[PDB]
Design a protein around this motif. Structure first.
Motif, short mmCIF file in Angstrom:
data_model
loop_
_atom_site.label_atom_id
_atom_site.label_comp_id
_atom_site.label_asym_id
_atom_site.label_seq_id
_atom_site.Cartn_x
_atom_site.Cartn_y
_atom_site.Cartn_z
N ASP A 1 0.87 -0.95 0.19
CA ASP A 1 -0.62 0.41 -0.02
C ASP A 1 0.96 1.64 0.12
OD1 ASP A 1 0.53 0.93 2.97
OD2 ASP A 1 -1.24 -0.49 3.94
N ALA A 2 -0.26 2.44 -0.04
CA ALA A 2 0.92 4.03 -0.31
C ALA A 2 1.64 4.00 0.64
CB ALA A 2 -0.61 4.50 -0.10
N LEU A 3 1.32 3.83 2.14
CA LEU A 3 2.14 4.13 3.27
C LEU A 3 2.96 3.19 3.44
CD1 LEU A 3 2.65 5.37 6.12
CD2 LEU A 3 0.94 4.18 7.03
N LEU B 1 4.59 2.09 1.27
CA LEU B 1 6.00 3.21 -0.03
C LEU B 1 6.98 3.18 0.68
CD1 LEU B 1 6.77 3.70 -2.61
CD2 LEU B 1 5.20 4.41 -2.91
N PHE B 2 6.14 4.09 1.22
CA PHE B 2 6.75 5.10 2.09
C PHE B 2 7.74 4.42 3.27
CE2 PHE B 2 6.05 9.02 0.74
CZ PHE B 2 4.75 9.19 -0.77
N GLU B 3 7.49 3.95 3.73
CA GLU B 3 7.50 2.60 5.23
C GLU B 3 8.99 2.57 4.00
OE1 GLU B 3 4.50 3.27 8.08
OE2 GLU B 3 4.86 1.56 6.75
N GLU C 1 11.66 5.14 3.31
CA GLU C 1 12.89 5.43 4.31
C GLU C 1 14.18 4.73 4.98
OE1 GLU C 1 9.89 6.74 7.73
OE2 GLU C 1 11.23 7.70 7.90
N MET D 1 15.90 11.00 0.93
CA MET D 1 14.96 10.84 0.76
C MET D 1 14.35 11.16 -0.71
SD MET D 1 13.59 8.59 1.76
CE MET D 1 11.39 8.56 1.63
N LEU E 1 12.82 9.35 -3.39
CA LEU E 1 11.53 8.90 -4.00
C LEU E 1 11.07 9.69 -5.68
CD1 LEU E 1 9.57 11.45 -1.10
CD2 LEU E 1 8.97 9.32 -1.62
N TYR F 1 -2.04 5.61 8.31
CA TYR F 1 -2.49 5.45 6.71
C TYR F 1 -3.45 5.87 6.65
CZ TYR F 1 -4.74 3.31 2.77
OH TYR F 1 -5.78 3.47 1.59
N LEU G 1 -2.20 9.34 5.62
CA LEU G 1 -1.95 9.62 4.58
C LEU G 1 -2.85 10.09 3.27
CD1 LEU G 1 0.34 9.29 2.86
CD2 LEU G 1 0.19 7.10 2.66
N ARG H 1 -7.94 -0.53 -0.53
CA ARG H 1 -6.69 0.29 -0.13
C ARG H 1 -6.31 1.18 -0.71
NH1 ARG H 1 -3.68 -0.18 5.32
NH2 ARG H 1 -4.71 -1.85 6.06
N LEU H 2 -5.15 2.07 -1.35
CA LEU H 2 -4.59 2.93 -2.00
C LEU H 2 -2.89 2.43 -2.25
CD1 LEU H 2 -4.76 5.44 -4.33
CD2 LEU H 2 -3.47 6.42 -2.12
N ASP H 3 -3.19 1.57 -3.69
CA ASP H 3 -1.64 0.95 -3.54
C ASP H 3 0.18 1.30 -4.07
OD1 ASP H 3 -1.66 0.69 -5.90
OD2 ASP H 3 -2.27 -0.53 -7.02
N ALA H 4 0.93 1.41 -4.08
CA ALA H 4 2.02 2.05 -4.13
C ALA H 4 1.60 2.47 -5.64
CB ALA H 4 2.93 1.31 -4.07
N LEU I 1 -0.46 5.17 -6.17
CA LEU I 1 -0.05 6.96 -4.59
C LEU I 1 0.27 7.83 -5.54
CD1 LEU I 1 2.57 8.32 -3.54
CD2 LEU I 1 0.45 8.21 -2.20
N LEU J 1 5.72 15.49 -3.66
CA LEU J 1 6.39 14.29 -3.01
C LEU J 1 7.19 14.44 -1.48
CD1 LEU J 1 9.01 12.78 -5.55
CD2 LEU J 1 6.08 12.01 -4.75
N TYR K 1 4.82 12.63 1.51
CA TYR K 1 6.26 12.02 2.80
C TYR K 1 5.90 12.83 4.50
CZ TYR K 1 10.41 10.12 5.35
OH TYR K 1 11.42 9.79 5.54
N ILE L 1 3.15 11.79 6.94
CA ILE L 1 3.87 10.70 7.21
C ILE L 1 4.59 10.95 8.33
CG2 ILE L 1 3.34 8.89 6.10
CD1 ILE L 1 6.33 8.88 5.75
#
Lengths: 84, 83
Positions: free
Chosen positions: A51-53, A55-57, A60, A70, A74, B8, B11, B49-52, B55, B74, B78, B81
């Motif tokens: 998922d989108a979160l 991806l950032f984790e 990081e 980053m 990114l 999540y 975000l 869920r919104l996938d990678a 995003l 971006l 970032y 979060i």
């Protein structure tokens, strides 16, 4: 069910490569994403969606292990996605 | 069958605000992501869920609509979060 989208699959493959370069096992990466090693294995084999979160984790911890900024990670990850 | 993870949710709430800031309806955003309006509605209500990949695609359309560099969106995302 297997995830079939091409651009999505290519992105996960690149992220898997990032994880490896960062010397992160599937178990170690899972820790940073609030997941289990099994969850990571399924993501990398396209059986479950990243998922989108997450991806950032992932970026990081990869950024931290490799000493990369980053903003560059990114941008590069974004640019890796073929627009055509 | 909703998602309750706090970071999540935060975000997605930010991305929803970006969507609105860019004057995009859920159908409009859906079209650009190759999804249905129902798909976007469920994402925004934490039911899907919104996938990678989605995003990046979402940020890309928002950047285009707002005339902003992707680096800026971006960073905004970032930075949202927390830790």
């Amino acid at each position: 069910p297997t995830i079939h989208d091409h651009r999505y699959r290519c992105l996960v493959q690149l992220l898997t490569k990032l994880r490896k370069e960062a010397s992160l096992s599937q178990s170690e990466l899972a820790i940073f994403l609030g997941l289990s090693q099994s969850d990571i294995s399924k993501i990398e084999s396209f059986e479950r969606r990243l998922d989108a979160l997450e991806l950032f984790e992932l970026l990081e911890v990869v950024a931290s292990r490799l000493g990369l900024p980053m903003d560059i990670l990114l941008k590069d990850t974004y640019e890796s996605i073929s627009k055509s």
